[PDB]
Design a protein around this ligand. Structure first.
Ligand SMILES: CCCCCCCCCCCCCCCCCC(=O)OC[C@H](COP(=O)([O-])OCC(O)COP(=O)([O-])OC[C@@H](COC(=O)CCCCCCCCCCCCCCCCC)OC(=O)CCCCCCCCCCCCCCCCC)OC(=O)CCCCCCCCCCCCCCCCC
Ligand SMILES: CCCCCCCCCCCCCCCCCC(=O)OC[C@H](COP(=O)([O-])OCC[N+](C)(C)C)OC(=O)CCCCCCCCCCCCCCCCC
Ligand SMILES: CCCCCCCCCCCCCCCCCC(=O)OC[C@H](COP(=O)([O-])OCC[N+](C)(C)C)OC(=O)CCCCCCCCCCCCCCCCC
Ligand SMILES: CCCCCCCCCCCCCCCCCC(=O)OC[C@H](COP(=O)(O)OCCN)OC(=O)CCCCCCCCCCCCCCCCC
Ligand SMILES: NC(=O)C1=CN([C@@H]2O[C@H](COP(=O)(O)OP(=O)(O)OC[C@H]3O[C@@H](n4cnc5c(N)ncnc54)[C@H](OP(=O)(O)O)[C@@H]3O)[C@@H](O)[C@H]2O)C=CC1
Ligand SMILES: CCCCCCCCCCCCCC(=O)SCCNC(=O)CCNC(=O)[C@@H](O)C(C)(C)COP(=O)(O)O
Ligand code: SF4
Ligand code: SF4
Ligand code: SF4
Ligand SMILES: [Zn+2]
Lengths: 297, 31, 96, 156, 95, 208, 380, 176, 114, 55, 41
């Protein structure tokens, strides 16, 4: 263990955590709070960004001086991936899209780019690799999202055999597309059961998976503490928000029930208490205001 | 020695009073 | 020069359209002025370096560079000292 | 291709409009504000660059943090930053706004306004001259000039 | 007199270079390591030794008040030259 | 000793010594020391029960008329059991003179507020509450004036550190400016500057 | 009930209790620029503490330099050389022009007259050129030091100060053409912020805040410092205690500052500019590089600093905002034990609540203008 | 030794009362103010054409820091730490050792330009004119750590600006 | 040992003032949660008030608890009047601060602090 | 200084003052940017005798 | 009477605003500093 990466300090902003993290997809919803929680420890965070550098500005106050290194990368360029990962001791993959674009389908975003990042991180000598799948990832799924994300989980597992794969169910937060989707839809109610997980719980689980040596090679399922039907969940969202862009793949995923995987470890096996929705739905949905809690199953 | 000094006779006079020059017609003439 | 102009307007630079590989036809920069002309233009002296040239040194840059911030040629800080504590390296032979 | 040329020309157009109509909200915290007042004074005259003098915070394009950011005012700075419409930029002016400055080791001073807001241009000096602040504003205009918003949108 | 590590990183005049396994090289990725290539230890070795006919010489570094404080250097050792502690110019008694 | 030495004003020294005798004998109930410095400034060191009677005297007596409160100050001296030295600087415009009134308190003894004598004191001793922790009894609105609203401690105490105990940053998770324990990227470098040789033999303290 | 308006974040927080148009209560919340300056001074030498004084009243830099320098020189029992004292009075009155331009023109700008701001800040830019030519900095010069000034005047500076001063009274005349007889400017200032003389003395007011109320008090006259007893000037005295007489007092103080500057340019003596005690002021660089004692003294003054004899002074000047004081306590070491900074704006902004009673909300920005408030010196 | 601003009693004859009534009804001082604004409309403005024209400066100007050399390439800094002792901001951080020829030279010379108060106490404390505060003021950056200068940056600033720094020192050293 | 009081002659008057300050904070917590639009509950804010009162529960000096009541009234005045922002109210809840190691062994693992 | 006499007369009439006699823009009347070198005097303590520091 | 009798030990720890970690885990050292043996003063 090199002398510059020995942890020092009291775990604050100017401290050294000994974590050198390359976070792919750091400019999104999960990457925001992951770079927040890494930078407040005093981690070296490498942010490869695809977007305008303006769109990375909010990542800059999150750490001490020189603790976030921004660099350009392309998903179809292994040289930029190697340029981003070759100094890191952990690589986190947060690359995702809810929709497929002209240049990137679900196979590019969920199979090609994660296998490229995992293979290049394996051949660069990166110790730890964390990949984010979805809880409902299945080969025989009705949505192309979950099919390609199951295929990408399989390829990440077979090219980085010590990768920590994490299954979040439905992540809610201030910049989510789960409660903000339901609050701005003003699609229906069916027999779909969901247990949504809070974003700070997911972030604490990822960072505890960085620090735990027992999390190597594991598959975690990050779920909330309470399973809800879809109908009374959506009615609870319209009740908290004081109310009386989509695609058919998103409709197939909203009407996909969150599966129960008791054989996989969860947030409690990483030392994270899963925050219920009723403590945090007001913090999300206060923006939508111009309450009896939802019934669990 | 050579030093930043005023000239031999000193500087010229410097105005410092109010000079509002009292222009215009009388109040009888302006009506 | 134009000494009939008032003090501040009486000296100016028309910048070059190309400096150190960068097209400066529209992107003129105040840091494009080399230091020998920077005395004259900022009126730190009356004498241009065509009249009173600067003193030649072997270590003065022959090629002036402008402000390189935002480029791949920008300054990145680093500790200039070496490692303070030397760690013990264990022997590469077994102990039996 | 044809669409790449169109989004390149539209990026050049919107970057031209945004850099030639920068409206600043100046946080007049301390001594640096005085020097900002000299960058609006007739010698430098920011208004001839399209940089208006004292735009209101809800229509401004850049926040100039000109002065020492104390702990008692840092939430007010962050609130005014959060009320600025996008695209918003932040120029940090002077040593106390940049890194704490002469009051860096104080109990009551934020060690640089980059702990509170994201900063685009750091203008050094104590105070930086009005000409150095105008240099930083023109460097911000050059930073806006090379933005690639629609090209990255067309490539995503 | 700059040289290069096997990582490709330039070694400063102090001798600073990061190790190969040091993560802090990532700050130069896509950017540059600013070094000064005019090493003062090599440039003062290029100066010739001043042969003087005195036993004690004075050095102020040139320029009078633009140099350093004026020091006096003894030249009784014929094995070693007399080096100025400020500017590194070195002197030898010619006898 | 003409060009570089400050000239001594013996006339003002004699006048301020006579007026210090005057104040000390009119008010012996509270006056503890009277001293005049070598640069001719008069200090009346009083008991803290006489904040109001001395200052009302100097404000209202026909031979004093110290109508202006120039400044009100505390000094923290931790080696004293009454560590805070409350300093009043008064200006008489009638007699063109200045006087210093000094008293003392510890952390727990309240000083009587002098807002009924000088309304100028209203913020100053309020600052003494914020910076030193000296409570002023019968103050109209005594609260903090300079520190942040939730600030713990009194910063101009000499056992309060230079950087504080907390520092602020914007945290984007909670969308809020937060306070955390202070970590400095560079510690303030303490300089031990005092020469071990005596500088002023006139100020030599007698040994043990 | 009555309305409570929290005018949030120089920078100032105001808590107004209004009763319609009228102001019932004005509570100024400050500390938005409290930087703990005078705790930082306790960990620095006297020379190191000097540049904090540039940054208190940051439109009156060399005046606060002069007040701190006079305090340290009083405790050191040394005096500056005569040319240093004349340079200090010259640049103190240039500084007074700077501050009263800032005061009058921003007080007019906040009321709505935006144009003489731009007219007078070019003159202010020329005086910042004078600061930059004498020290190297446009604002925070660090030039007036304990012992004198740091560096002698460059050649040709006094001619340019003469060329400025010869023309500046016409600039005051056209400012006074824009504002003084203007009925809109008189309606915003004549019945506004009336302070009696007894309340101004009792509330700790100083400077124009006393002199607008008719109090014949000026510290350059009554308690004179460096060579102000050798210059001839008048003290403008108000009659009604309002914003308008304080405006006229500041305009006439610009007139009298031009008068003092003419007298300083004509009566500048030759000689040295630091005290020739090299245990206080650093020696010249040519003798530092030649003499052993001078090098030792240079070393010790720039690392330890001079020891100041133990004691406490309250040294005040007539700064352009009023009485600027330093209560400086030395323990015998080369660092100040305590440095309380008395600013005029502190007591003036404390008196804002009495001055604003019975006025409108638009009158409060005029009263905050007539109290020349810079929050650097208010908050330290 | 004092004068009374605004202690004029206005004349109450019909001439002066009619003058004040004509000023009230016919807006005379307002036309005076419009005349003064119209007078500045026809003046040449004070605006210089930045960046093509520059504000005038003196050779004393305190701008960007630089480490200088002797006229042999040997650096002037002999690691005496006077500049960091006098530095009011503690912006200077120095570490030193004997180098390979036994010379007293720095291994670390850092100036945090965001702590720096640009007051020039370092250049006047420097016994060998090594650290100077040069003439550059146009060195704004896009990132905070680009203003944390190490010794390599300061020596490159010296090598960059020495032709100007030496001539500014030549113009001013007799005042020092 | 004869000292001048601040407000309370003994500890009973002091406990009376402590008790009235606790009553005022208990009444103020729901209004504070409402108008600062806090993300905590009223029960959680009242638990924080009880924690801040029980933190000082070991004091037996009447002058010290008089100053504690005075400072609590100052904090309450800064809360009722909107002088604090939401950040100052939420500084009592150290939410972004990671939990410190409590036992010997985790403090041994992370560093040198006792 | 480069204003024509019609604009100069209109400007002097509108201000009511003679503006060309006192121009706020500076011209050749100001000091040269290159000066001769100074020879600064020394203070009273620069003496070789009767100059004991205790006096 | 106007004076109360407090027989308790003087303790101002709840008033100084110091966090508890820097009260009960710190060891103050009270000492006359040793002479720098580089100097005879
Ligand atoms: C009234 C309507 C406008 C009449 C023209 C006018 O006022 O000319 C200014 C002219 C010169 O004024 P000035 O302020 O004394 O000139 C000072 C300059 O520094 C002296 O001028 P200069 O030395 O700087 O000379 C160079 C200057 C020469 O200036 C011109 O050519 C002025 C523009 C003339 C059209 O040329 C330029 O700077 C190029 C100007 C290009 C843009 C012109 C835009 C015109 C507006 C209509 C489109 O005014 C007069 O001669 C007095 C008024 C004449 C009125 C005639 C009856 C109508
Ligand atoms: C009346 C006078 C004014 C007239 C109107 C103005 C004239 C020009 C009108 C078109 C300007 C260009 C499009 C609007 C500006 C878009 C700027 C921008 O941020 O774009 C990025 C945005 C978003 O790109 P993005 O997907 O990269 O978003 C990044 C932002 N985050 C990360 C937060 C999501 O692009 C668009 O919205 C594209 C809009 C259409 C582009 C032009 C089509 C042809 C028009 C003819
Ligand atoms: C087509 C052009 C149209 C515009 C022409 C003017 C353009 C230029 C204007 C420049 C100034 C603009 C300033 C904006 C703000 C104006 C403020 C202002 O002036 O307020 C009004 C001011 C207010 O004055 P005041 O209130 O400030 O003065 C104090 C007055 N007392 C003491 C009574 C309280 O004046 C008026 O109200 C006058 C109104 C217009 C009168 C016009 C003249 C009438 C004369 C009749 C004949 C009288 C003869 C004698 C009697 C015998 C009769 C038989
Ligand atoms: C398929 C191809 C077409 C695709 C769609 C595009 C349609 C046409 C849009 C306008 C033209 C596109 C290009 C815009 C300018 C790009 C070049 C540019 O920015 O040049 C810079 C130059 C000034 O250089 P600068 O860097 O600012 O100098 C610093 C100061 N010394 O700048 C200049 O010299 C001035 C630039 C002016 C820009 C054009 C004029 C304004 C736009 C008019 C049309 C749009 C608005 C319509 C009406 C709106 C309401 C009035
Ligand atoms: N509800 C949820 O949020 C859940 C999310 N997940 C998974 O967690 C991961 C992170 O989620 P989240 O933050 O919400 O997603 P976002 O859409 O908010 O962000 C995804 C990130 O990936 C980047 N990215 C997307 N497509 C590409 C591409 N083609 N090339 C390069 N970069 C690309 C984006 O960059 P840019 O800004 O430039 O587009 C962005 O930084 C995803 O893999 C998602 O599937 C799993 C379960 C639940
Ligand atoms: C939202 C957050 C708001 C936070 C509010 C912070 C307010 C902090 C105010 C602090 C005031 C005090 O702590 S004064 C208490 C000190 N009292 C003592 O030391 C005496 C002992 N007191 C007690 O034990 C108290 O419980 C009682 C009720 C007075 C007596 O109980 P005992 O009998 O059993
Ligand atoms: S960087 Fe300096 S001049 Fe600027 S506001 Fe701070 S203290 Fe004042
Ligand atoms: S100019 Fe002043 S603050 Fe800056 S490095 Fe030099 S001594 Fe330090
Ligand atoms: S004062 Fe000069 S020689 Fe001494 S350490 Fe600093 S730069 Fe080097
Ligand atoms: Zn030498």
């Amino acid at each position: 263990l090199h002398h510059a990466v020995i942890p020092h300090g009291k775990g604050g902003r100017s401290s050294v955590s000994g974590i050198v993290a390359t976070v792919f997809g750091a400019t999104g919803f999960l990457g925001r709070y992951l770079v927040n929680h890494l930078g407040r420890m005093g981690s070296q965070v490498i942010v490869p960004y695809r977007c305008e550098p303006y769109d990375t500005m909010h990542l800059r106050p999150m750490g001490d001086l020189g603790q976030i290194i921004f660099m350009d990368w392309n998903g179809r360029d292994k040289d930029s991936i190697r340029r981003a990962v070759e100094h890191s001791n952990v690589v986190i993959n947060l690359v995702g899209r809810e929709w497929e674009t002209k240049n990137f389908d679900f196979e590019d975003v969920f199979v090609k780019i994660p296998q490229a990042i995992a293979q290049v991180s394996k051949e660069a000598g990166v110790e730890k690799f964390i990949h984010i799948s979805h809880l409902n990832a299945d080969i025989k799924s009705s949505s192309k999202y979950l099919r390609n994300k199951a295929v990408g989980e399989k390829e990440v597992r077979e090219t980085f055999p010590e990768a920590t794969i994490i299954k979040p169910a439905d992540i809610f937060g201030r910049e989510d597309r789960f409660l903000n989707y339901f609050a701005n839809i003003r699609s229906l109610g069916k027999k779909t059961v969901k247990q949504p997980v809070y974003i700070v719980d997911v972030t604490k689980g990822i960072i505890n998976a960085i620090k735990d040596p027992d999390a190597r090679g594991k598959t975690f399922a990050f779920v909330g503490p309470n399973r809800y039907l879809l109908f009374d969940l959506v009615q609870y969202v319209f009740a908290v928000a004081h109310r009386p862009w989509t695609t058919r793949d998103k409709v197939e995923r909203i009407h996909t029930t969150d599966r129960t995987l008791p054989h996989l470890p969860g947030l409690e096996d990483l030392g994270v208490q899963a925050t219920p929705l009723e403590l945090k739905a007001i913090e999300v949905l206060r923006r939508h205001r111009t309450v009896q809690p939802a019934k669990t199953v | 020695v050579k030093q930043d000094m005023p000239p031999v006779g000193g500087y010229g006079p410097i105005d410092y009073k109010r000079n509002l020059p009292r222009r215009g017609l009388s109040g009888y003439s302006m009506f | 020069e134009d000494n009939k102009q008032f003090f501040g307007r009486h000296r100016w630079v028309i910048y070059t359209t190309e400096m150190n590989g960068k097209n400066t036809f529209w992107d003129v920069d105040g840091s494009m002025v080399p230091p020998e002309w920077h005395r004259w233009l900022h009126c730190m002296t009356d004498d241009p370096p065509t009249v009173k040239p600067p003193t030649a040194r072997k270590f003065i840059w022959t090629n002036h560079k402008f402000n390189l911030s935002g480029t791949p040629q920008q300054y990145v800080p680093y500790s200039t000292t070496r490692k303070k504590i030397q760690e013990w390296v264990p022997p590469s032979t077994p102990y039996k | 291709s044809r669409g790449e040329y169109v989004v390149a020309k539209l990026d050049d157009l919107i970057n031209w409009a945004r850099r030639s109509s920068l409206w600043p909200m100046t946080f007049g915290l301390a001594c640096c504000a005085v020097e900002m007042m000299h960058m609006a004074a007739p010698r430098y005259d920011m208004d001839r660059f399209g940089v208006v003098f004292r735009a209101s915070p809800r229509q401004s394009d850049v926040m100039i943090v000109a002065g020492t950011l104390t702990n008692k005012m840092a939430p007010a700075l962050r609130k005014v930053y959060d009320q600025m419409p996008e695209p918003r930029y932040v120029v940090s002016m002077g040593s106390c706004a940049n890194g704490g400055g002469y009051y860096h080791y104080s109990y009551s001073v934020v060690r640089g306004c980059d702990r509170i807001v994201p900063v685009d241009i750091y203008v050094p000096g104590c105070p930086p001259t009005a000409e150095a602040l105008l240099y930083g504003i023109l460097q911000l205009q050059k930073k806006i000039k090379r933005e690639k918003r629609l090209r990255i949108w067309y490539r995503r | 007199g700059v040289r290069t590590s096997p990582t490709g990183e330039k070694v400063t005049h102090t001798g600073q270079v990061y190790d190969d396994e040091d993560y802090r090289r990532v700050r130069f990725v896509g950017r540059q390591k600013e070094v000064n290539e005019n090493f003062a230890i090599d440039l003062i070795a290029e100066q010739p030794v001043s042969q003087v006919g005195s036993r004690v010489i004075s050095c102020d570094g040139g320029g009078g008040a633009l140099g350093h404080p004026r020091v006096y250097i003894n030249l009784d050792k014929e094995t070693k030259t007399g080096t100025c502690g400020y500017c590194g110019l070195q002197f030898r008694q010619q006898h | 000793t003409r060009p570089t030495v400050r000239p001594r004003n013996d006339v003002a020294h004699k006048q301020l010594s006579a007026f210090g005798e005057y104040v000390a004998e009119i008010l012996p109930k509270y006056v503890q020391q009277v001293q005049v410095s070598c640069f001719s400034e008069l200090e009346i060191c009083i008991h803290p029960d006489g904040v109001i009677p001395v200052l009302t005297f100097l404000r209202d007596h026909s031979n004093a008329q110290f109508k202006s409160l120039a400044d009100l100050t505390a000094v923290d001296i931790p080696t004293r059991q009454n560590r805070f030295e409350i300093v009043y600087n008064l200006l008489s415009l009638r007699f063109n003179s200045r006087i210093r009134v000094k008293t003392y308190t510890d952390e727990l003894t309240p000083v009587e507020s002098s807002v009924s004598v000088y309304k100028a004191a209203n913020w100053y001793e309020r600052e003494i509450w914020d910076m030193f922790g000296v409570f002023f009894a019968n103050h109209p609105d005594l609260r903090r004036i300079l520190t942040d609203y939730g600030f713990e401690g009194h910063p101009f105490r000499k056992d309060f550190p230079l950087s504080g105990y907390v520092e602020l940053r914007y945290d984007d998770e909670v969308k809020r400016v937060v306070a955390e324990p202070v970590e400095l990227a560079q510690e303030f470098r303490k300089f031990d500057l005092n020469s071990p040789w005596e500088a002023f033999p006139a100020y030599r303290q007698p040994p043990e | 009930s009555n309305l409570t308006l929290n005018f949030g974040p120089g920078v100032l927080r105001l808590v107004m209790e209004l009763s319609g148009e009228m102001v019932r209560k004005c509570d100024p919340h400050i500390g938005l620029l409290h930087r703990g300056t005078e705790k930082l001074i306790e960990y620095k030498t006297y020379l190191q503490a000097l540049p904090y004084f540039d940054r208190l009243d940051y439109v009156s830099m060399m005046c606060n330099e002069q007040a701190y320098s006079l305090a340290v020189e009083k405790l050191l029992n040394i005096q500056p050389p005569p040319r240093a004292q004349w340079i200090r009075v010259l640049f103190g009155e240039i500084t007074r022009l700077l501050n009263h331009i800032m005061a009058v023109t921003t007080h007019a700008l906040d009321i709505g007259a935006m144009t003489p701001f731009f007219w007078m800040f070019e003159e202010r830019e020329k005086m910042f050129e004078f600061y930059e030519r004498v020290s190297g900095a446009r604002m925070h010069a660090a030039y007036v030091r304990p012992g004198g000034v740091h560096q002698d005047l460059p050649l040709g500076l006094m001619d340019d100060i003469y060329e400025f001063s010869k023309n500046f009274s016409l600039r005051i005349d056209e400012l006074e053409e824009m504002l003084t007889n203007n009925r809109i400017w008189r309606n915003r200032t004549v019945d506004i912020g009336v302070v009696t003389a007894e309340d101004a003395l009792n509330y700790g007011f100083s400077g124009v805040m006393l002199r607008g109320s008719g109090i014949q008090w000026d510290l350059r006259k009554t308690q004179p410092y460096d060579v102000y007893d050798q210059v001839e000037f008048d003290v403008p005295i108000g009659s009604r205690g309002d914003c308008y007489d304080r405006y006229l007092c500041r305009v006439e103080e610009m007139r009298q500052s031009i008068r003092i500057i003419s007298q300083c340019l004509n009566k500048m003596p030759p000689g040295e500019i630091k005290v020739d005690d090299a245990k206080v002021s650093p020696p010249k660089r040519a003798e530092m590089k030649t003499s052993m004692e001078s090098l030792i003294h240079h070393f010790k003054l720039y690392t330890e600093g001079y020891q100041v004899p133990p004691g406490a002074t309250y040294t005040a000047i007539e700064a352009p905002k009023g009485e600027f004081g330093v209560y400086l306590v030395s323990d015998g070491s080369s660092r100040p034990y305590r440095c309380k900074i008395k600013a005029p704006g502190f007591a003036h902004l404390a008196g804002l609540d009495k001055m604003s009673k019975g006025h409108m909300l638009a009158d409060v920005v005029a009263i905050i203008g007539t109290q020349d408030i810079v929050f650097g010196e208010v908050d330290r | 030794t004092y004068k009374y601003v605004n202690l004029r009693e206005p004349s109450m004859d019909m001439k002066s009362v009619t003058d004040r009534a004509a000023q009230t009804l016919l807006w005379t001082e307002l036309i005076r103010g419009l005349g003064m604004t119209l007078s500045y409309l026809f003046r040449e403005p004070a605006t210089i054409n930045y960046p093509f024209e520059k504000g005038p400066l003196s050779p004393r100007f305190r701008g960007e820091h630089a480490l200088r050399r002797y006229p042999s390439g040997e650096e002037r800094c002999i690691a005496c730490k006077l500049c960091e002792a006098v530095c009011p901001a503690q912006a200077i951080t120095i570490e030193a050792e004997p180098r390979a020829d036994g010379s007293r030279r720095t291994t670390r010379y850092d100036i945090d330009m965001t702590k720096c108060i640009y007051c020039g106490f370092c250049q006047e404390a420097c016994p060998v004119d090594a650290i100077v505060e040069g003439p550059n003021f146009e060195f704004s950056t896009e990132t905070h750590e680009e203003l944390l200068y190490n010794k390599e940056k300061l020596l490159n600033n010296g090598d960059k600006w020495e032709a100007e720094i030496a001539a500014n020192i030549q113009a001013d050293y007799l005042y020092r | 040992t004869s000292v001048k009081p601040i407000f309370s002659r003994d500890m009973n008057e002091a406990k009376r003032r402590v008790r009235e300050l606790y009553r005022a904070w208990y009444r103020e917590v729901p209004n504070t949660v409402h108008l600062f639009q806090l993300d905590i509950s009223v029960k959680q804010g009242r638990d924080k008030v009880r924690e801040m009162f029980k933190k000082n529960a070991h004091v037996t000096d009447p002058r010290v608890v008089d100053l504690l009541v005075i400072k609590g009234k100052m904090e309450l005045e800064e809360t009722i009047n909107v002088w604090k922002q939401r950040t100052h109210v939420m500084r009592f809840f150290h939410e972004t601060e990671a939990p410190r190691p409590k036992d010997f062994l985790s403090k041994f693992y992370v560093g040198h602090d006792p | 200084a480069s204003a024509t006499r019609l604009i100069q007369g209109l400007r002097n009439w509108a201000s009511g003052r003679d503006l060309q006699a006192k121009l706020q823009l500076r011209y050749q009347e100001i000091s040269k940017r290159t000066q001769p070198p100074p020879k600064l005097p020394v203070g009273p303590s620069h003496r070789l005798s009767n100059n004991y520091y205790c006096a | 009477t106007q004076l109360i009798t407090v027989d308790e030990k003087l303790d101002i720890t709840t008033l100084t605003g110091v966090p508890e970690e820097h009260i009960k885990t710190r060891k103050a050292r009270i000492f006359v500093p040793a002479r720098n043996n580089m100097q005879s003063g």
